[PDB]
Design a protein around this ligand. Structure first.
Ligand code: NA
Length: 129
């Protein structure tokens, strides 16, 4: 599924991401824009041989099992394919584990490089929330 911007903001808020571990909702929408272009089906190979999956591009080295990443953990206890659903529940629950770890949202390379330090609020402008 390719979400609209305000559609995804509403779904992330419903699932409890607004101000989760101190990160406002625009941060989570901006990360999704630059990680996946709002597309649940997005998949991208990493140079280390792992792969990133779904709306928030969650990695197979530590977080999910995709069957093809040697020496890897599955800390969210899920098949990586679960992260491609039109239902974002799996992506959200895994993200809540990642963001609690200690590095916060710096775990997402696109957030650090394109969202951090910008007017992220702009990503929810016009939305009835
Ligand atoms: Na894995």
């Amino acid at each position: 599924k390719v979400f609209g911007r305000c559609e995804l903001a509403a779904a992330m808020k419903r699932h409890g991401l607004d101000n989760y571990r101190g990160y406002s909702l625009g941060n989570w929408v901006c990360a999704a824009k630059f990680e996946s272009n709002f597309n649940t089906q997005a998949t991208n190979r990493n140079t280390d041989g792992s792969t990133d999956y779904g709306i928030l591009q969650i990695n197979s080295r530590w977080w999910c099992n995709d069957g093809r990443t040697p020496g890897s953990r599955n800390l969210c206890n899920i098949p990586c394919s679960a992260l491609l659903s039109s239902d974002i529940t799996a992506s959200v629950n895994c993200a809540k584990k990642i963001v609690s770890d200690g590095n916060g949202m710096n775990a997402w390379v696109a957030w650090r490089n394109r969202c951090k330090g910008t007017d992220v609020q702009a990503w929810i402008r016009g939305c009835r929330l």
